[PDB]
Structure 1
C-alpha cells in the first residue's frame, strides 16, 4: 500500500513531457528526401527514498513525404537514483568521447543498454555503460554493432571514464572502452577554459585503438586540438587533427566520432589524414536579431593514404544559417539551412543541402 502506491503517484506528479515536430529535407548532388517526424519525450519523477526509481519514454514517428524514416518506435528507460548518481537501463541517447549517439537527421539514434553516471566526488564525473544494440537514426529496429570503415560485428560496447576538474578552468578526461570482437580504444583529453570576461577554450584530444578478440590486427591513433575564441558576438575556432597508424579512426558505425574536425559530412578520420579547420560564428543577438545564427567552417585534409602513397587530399566547407522565432504564435519555431561542399581525390565530390524545420512544445 502506502509507499508503493505513493511511489507510482510521485512518478507522475514530478514528471514532464514534450512534443517535438521536425520537418527535414535533404539533397545530395554528386559532381533527395523529404520527411516529417514526431518526437514525444516523457521523463518521470522519482519515487521517494534513499534509492529512487523512475521511467522515461521516447516515442518516435517518421514518414517520408513526396517532394527508412518511415517507422514508429516506443522506447522505455528504467531509471534509479541514489545521492548524486543515476542509472538508466533501456533506450539510451548520450554523448561521450568513446561513444556518442547521433541526432542530425529526422529521428535520433538510440542505443540499448545500461548507463551509469556518478557525481559523488567534487569536480569528478564518472560514467560507464554496457550497450548491446544500435538503432540507427533512420530505422526502427535495434541491431548489432559494427565499426565505421573497418566493419566487423559486435554485440557489446563497454566503457568507463572520468572527467575531472583539476582546477575550475582545467578538466582532464580519461575514457577506456571496447567494442567486443572488433576494437579496444582509450581516450585522454585536457580542456582548458579561459574566461577573460571574451574567452578561449583549448581542447586537446588523444585516442589510441587496437584490435579486440579475434579481429584482424588494428592500429590507430588520433590527435586533435581545437582552440575556440569568443569575442563578443563573434567566435573563431582553429582546429588541427592528425590520424596515424595502419587504420582509420574507429567508432561505432552510425554514431558520432569525437574528432575535432568531424563536421557536416566528413570525419577527416581517414588513414594518415592530417587536417586543419577554421570556423566562424556570429550571434545576431547583440545586433538586435536574437533568433538568427550564422556559422561557416572549412576543413582541409592531406597526407591521406591512397594505396602505398600518401597523396590523398580533401576539403569540406559548411555553412549554417538559422532562425528561431522569438515571439508571437509561432514562438520556438526554428528553421536551419545547412549547406556543405566536399571535394576529394579519393572519394565522391558532393554538395549537400539540409533544411530542417523544428518546433517543440512543452506538454507539462
Structure 2
C-alpha cells in the first residue's frame, strides 16, 4: 500500500574538506528521502520525494555553490519528486531521481547528491535479465540548487538537449557472473557503448573477482564538444581472504580522445577510479594496487580501512603528451555497531595527487553521517 509500505530516511551529513596545494570548507547537509509504497492492483502507483539542504559553517570544495564574486553561499537546497508506476516486474519512474547506471553514475562525493530530471524504466520480466532505458533532460550538480542542461566533462559549457540510454544485464552461473551491454547518447555531444563482465569464484578460502569493462566513445550529432573518438578498457581484479582484500587494476585509454561522461557525474564505473580522478586522459595507461582490511580482526567491529595507489603515464592533454600522474588514497571508516549512537558513521580520508600536467595537492576529509529512518 501507498502509506503502508512508505519509508522515510533522513541523513545528517557533517562534512569537513581541506585541500593543500591551504584552503578549507565546512558544511552541514540534510538529505531527506520519502519513498511511498505502491497502490495495489495491476498498475501500482507511487511517489518518491527528495529534499536537500546544505548550510555553510565557518572556515572544490564544491560543498556549496559560489556567488559570482567567488564567495560560497550561506545555504542552498531543493526538493524533487518522482512518480512511479509498476506493472508485473517492470517499473517506470518520471521526475527527479538519482540514476546509478554504468553510463551515468550520480555523484554523491560532497555535501548533497547530484540529481537528474527525466524518466527511467527497469524491466525484469525474464529470469536473470534486467533491461533498462531512459532519458534525462536536466541535471542539478552536487554543488548547485538549480537544474541545468546536461553537458560532457570534456566540454562542460557545451549544452545538450538530453541523455538517452538503454542497457541489459544478465546474471547467471549461480549468481557468480554477470554480463552487461549498454548504449548511451548525450545528444549532439557524444555516444558511448559499454560492455562489462563481472565474475567471482571461490577457490578454497579465497574469493577471486574480476570486473572487466570496455567503453567506446564517438561524437554525436552536431558534435558540440568537438570530434571525439576514444576507447577505454579496464580490468579490476580482486583477491579476498578472511578479513583482507587485495586489488590490482589495469586500464588503457586509446584513440584521439579521453573517456566521455556527463559533467558533474561520478567516474566510479571506471576500473581505476579514485577520490580525485580515474586516469582517463587520452592515451593514458594506468595501474592501481589496493588493500582493504576489516578491523573486526583487532576487536574493532565496524571499523574498516582502505589504502590504494594509482599511477598513470602516456597522458595526452591540451598542454602536451607523455603526461604522468599518481594518486594515493587512505581511508578509515567507522560505523557505530550498537548503543545510542548506532549507525553513526565517521569517515576520515586523505588523498595525495601529483600530476606532471596539472596542479599537485593533498586533500583531507572528515565526514560524519547519521541516518534516521521511520
TM bucket, shorter chain? over 0.9
Match of 2:15 in 1: 24
Alignment of 1:163-242 (within 5 A): 163-168=169-174, 169-196=176-203, 198-215=206-223, 216-242=226-252
Q: Deviations over 1:297-329 (max 9, x none)?
A: 000000112569632100000000111111221
Question: C-alpha root-mean-square deviation of aligned residues, in Å?
Answer: 1.4
CA contact (8 A) 1:150 1:250 kept: no
Select the residue among 57, 60, 67 that pairs with 2:49: 57
Match of 1:312 in 2: 323
Match of 1:125 in 2: 130
CA contact (8 A) 1:291 1:323 kept: yes
Q: Normalising by the residue count of structure 1, what TM-score does the alignment of the two structures yield?
A: 0.94
For structure 1, the residue ranges without an aligned partner over 5 or more in a row are 1-9
Alignment of 1:293-308 (within 5 A): 293-305=304-316
Quick check: 1:357 aligned with 2:368? yes
Give 3-state SS (helix, strand or coil) of 2:104's partner: coil
Match of 1:88 in 2: 93
CA contact (8 A) 1:313 1:346 kept: yes
Match of 1:277 in 2: 288
Query: Offset of 1:21 from its aligned partner?
Result: 0.3
Match of 2:167 in 1: 161
Aligned counterparts of 2:305 and 2:371: Cα–Cα separation in 1: 21
CA contact (8 A) 2:319 2:357 kept: no
Select the residue among 255, 260, 268 that pairs with 1:245: 255
Aligned counterparts of 1:146 and 1:82: Cα–Cα separation in 2: 33
Aligned counterparts of 2:344 and 2:172: Cα–Cα separation in 1: 40
Give 3-state SS (helix, strand or coil) of 1:120's partner: coil
Query: Offset of 1:262 from its aligned partner?
Result: 1.3
Q: Normalising by the residue count of structure 2, what TM-score does the alignment of the two structures yield?
A: 0.92
Q: Deviations over 1:46-68 (max 9, x none)?
A: 11101100001111110110022
Query: Offset of 1:198 from its aligned partner?
Result: 2.5
Q: Deviations over 1:248-270 (max 9, x none)?
A: 11100100132111110012011
Aligned counterparts of 2:167 and 2:218: Cα–Cα separation in 1: 18
Moved over 4 A (4+): 306-309
Aligned counterparts of 1:83 and 1:247: Cα–Cα separation in 2: 43
Match of 2:39 in 1: 47
Give 3-state SS (helix, strand or coil) of 2:273's partner: coil
Match of 1:255 in 2: 265
CA contact (8 A) 2:7 2:36 kept: yes
Give 3-state SS (helix, strand or coil) of 2:82's partner: strand
Aligned counterparts of 1:129 and 1:351: Cα–Cα separation in 2: 38
Aligned counterparts of 1:38 and 1:217: Cα–Cα separation in 2: 41
For structure 2, the residue ranges without an aligned partner over 5 or more in a row are 66-74
Aligned counterparts of 1:308 and 1:272: Cα–Cα separation in 2: 14
Query: Offset of 1:362 from its aligned partner?
Result: 1.1
Query: Offset of 1:139 from its aligned partner?
Result: 0.9
